[PDB]
């Protein structure tokens, strides 16, 4: 797997499952790489994994990929290795990686089962754009016999909120595709706003698609509860103050793909570590990284 296969592999892993996240496929590529590396050096593997993660940072431009790379590098190197000839080391590392992958895979379902208790009957959900986590939590909400209307923005650089509305209209829930510049128009009728984030920074703020900040601020001015539903591998060791303080490799005549929402604009988070206030996101994030 001299990096070319890795890029190719990653792609094969992302196109084989369309309902699969990108960072999960990145961690599956890292686990494949460790599984078939053929290097006997407890350190020889760290440099190879770092090069792999920079090829998975170059191929995928998402924040979650680099976050999952750091979390996979920490979680594989956790137990008391004490290897004689790396054989024990590599086997334990592979075991840890598989355990980590399974935890990630059951994370989303945990998110949905822990989050759908906030949607009241007859509520109006406001949603930014397509993410499998908020779609799963809405399918858990409709699984509990609840009736609610969903206004999904379109998110203009790639009309994916329209794709979310297509995938949610098949769920037989009342959905309305709202133009992206109408989030101040429909905030007065949308009582709560559920948005899936793609990256959670240390203070509790979120890194997301370009229209989240204006949506979150419009939710703060109308006192609407802004809920974020994200996994545990989407945590990041960044601390942006402004919208320019996010790194440029996650951003991209001035068409950014990613904004930042302050933790003061966020009511709750729904991670697999629990329903967290943003100061709990800071505590848990530091603890989790370990």
């Amino acid at each position: 797997m001299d990096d070319k296969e890795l890029i190719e592999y990653f792609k094969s892993q992302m196109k084989e499952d369309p309902d699969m996240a990108s960072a999960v496929a990145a961690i599956r590529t890292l686990l494949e790489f460790l599984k078939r590396d053929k290097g006997e050096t407890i350190q020889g593997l760290r440099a190879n994994l770092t090069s792999a993660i920079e090829t998975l940072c170059g191929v995928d431009s998402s924040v979650a990929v680099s976050s999952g790379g750091e979390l996979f590098l920490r979680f594989i190197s956790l137990a008391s290795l004490e290897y004689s000839d790396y054989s024990k080391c590599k086997k334990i590392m592979i075991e840890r990686g598989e355990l980590f992958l399974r935890r990630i895979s059951l994370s989303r379902n945990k998110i949905a089962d822990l989050c759908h208790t906030f949607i009241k009957d007859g509520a109006t959900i406001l949603t930014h754009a397509y993410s499998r986590v908020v779609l799963r939590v809405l399918e858990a909400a409709v699984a509990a016999k609840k009736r609610f209307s969903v206004y999904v923005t379109e998110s203009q650089p790639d009309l994916s909120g329209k794709k979310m509305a297509k995938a949610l209209c098949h769920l037989n829930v009342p959905v309305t595709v709202v133009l992206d510049a109408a989030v101040g128009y429909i905030m007065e009728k949308a009582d709560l706003v559920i948005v899936g984030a793609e990256g959670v920074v240390e203070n509790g703020g979120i890194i997301n698609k370009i229209g989240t900040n204006q949506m979150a601020v419009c939710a703060k001015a109308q006192n609407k509860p802004f809920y974020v539903v994200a996994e545990s591998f989407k945590f990041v060791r960044l601390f942006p103050l402004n919208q320019q303080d996010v790194p440029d490799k996650f951003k991209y005549e001035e068409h950014p793909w990613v904004d930042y929402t302050a933790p003061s604009l966020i009511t709750l988070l729904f991670t697999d570590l629990g329903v967290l206030t943003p100061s709990a996101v800071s505590d848990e994030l530091i603890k989790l990284y370990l």
Binding site: D121, K145, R147, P174
Partner: protein, 321 residues
């Protein structure tokens, strides 16, 4: 002394026809809960240690319904005694059966089986015991009433009662119903016998929670034509120079109490239960712990059970169960 109660689980009125020809009116559900459960919950919440259920018509069905309830469990604090006979046919027959069986000991609660209430009677029972210790067994019955305006949909035209009470000692001097009478006649010996004040009361909704004494059963076995409660109080208030036995009264202004007698009381009391006027006895509290009756209380008094599956576009605005 332990507090006893006599529950008449068969209203001998011909009112729920033909509703009552299948199940007796005491098994009639207000909101998924039969009336006998409401009455037993009121008796157990007031603090009654032993009741005597007296069931005449369709009594085997009441027996099969009430044995599997909460009040016949051995873990229940309020023990019940299901007493059925196909011979008695009126309330006076129930109390003369009580005197013949010698069931009560001291100051029981005579109540019908279809009364919805949450009245804590221990203050009124303390007042009754004080009057029994002061007058040396002269005060016989303490009728419990509730303050209510005559315009309330609870009190209907067949059951509106007007009382005349000495308000300083809270005893009943005159008692009559207003069925078919626009004017009300009060005798004058009431004022000449007691010149320490007198007050008329039309604001009293009858709860039928008459606290009684073993002298009540003595008076019911002493006089055969006393068929029901109003016959007893009307024969006791017109006869003072014989069988003196003055009747007292208690009025509650902070607790709910009403019994069902027709469809009108049924609708009014059910609307009061759904609108939570009888807290704690609310349909989400599940005072009868039946697994098929638990509900969730949403806004506008909407009570929803499990596995309801509301359809799309279904609008429930207020007071839905």
């Amino acid at each position: 002394p332990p507090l006893q109660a006599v529950l008449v689980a068969d209203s001998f009125d011909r009112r729920f026809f033909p509703i009552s020809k299948d199940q007796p009116r005491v098994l009639l559900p207000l909101a998924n809960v039969a009336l006998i459960d409401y009455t037993l919950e009121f008796l157990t919440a007031t603090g009654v240690q032993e009741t005597f259920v007296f069931c005449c018509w369709k009594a085997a069905q009441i027996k099969e319904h009430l044995l599997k309830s909460k009040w016949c469990r051995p873990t229940s604090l309020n023990v019940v005694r299901i007493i059925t006979s196909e011979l008695y046919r009126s309330l006076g027959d129930v109390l003369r059966d009580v005197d013949a069986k010698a069931l009560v000991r001291s100051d029981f609660l005579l109540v019908y089986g279809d009364v919805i209430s949450n009245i804590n009677i221990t203050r009124a029972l303390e007042e009754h015991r004080l009057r029994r210790k002061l007058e040396k067994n002269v005060s016989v019955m303490t009728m419990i009433f509730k303050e209510s305006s005559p315009s309330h949909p609870t009190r209907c035209h067949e059951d509106n009662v007007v009382v005349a009470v000495d308000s300083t000692t809270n005893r009943v001097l005159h008692f009559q119903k207003t069925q078919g009478l626009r004017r009300f006649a009060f005798p004058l010996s009431l004022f000449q016998g007691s010149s320490d004040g007198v007050e008329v009361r039309y604001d009293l909704l009858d709860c039928h929670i008459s606290i009684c004494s073993p002298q009540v059963a003595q008076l019911f076995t002493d006089n055969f034509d006393y068929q029901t409660r109003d016959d007893f109080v009307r024969g006791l208030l017109v006869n003072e120079e014989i069988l003196g036995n003055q009747i007292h009264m208690h009025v509650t202004a902070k607790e709910y109490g009403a019994r069902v007698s027709n469809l009108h009381m049924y609708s009014a009391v059910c609307a009061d239960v759904i609108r939570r006027w009888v807290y704690p006895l609310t349909p989400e509290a599940n005072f009868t712990d039946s697994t098929t009756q638990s509900c969730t209380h949403s806004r506008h008094n909407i009570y929803r059970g499990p596995e309801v599956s509301l359809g799309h576009g279904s609008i429930l605005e207020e007071n839905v169960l």
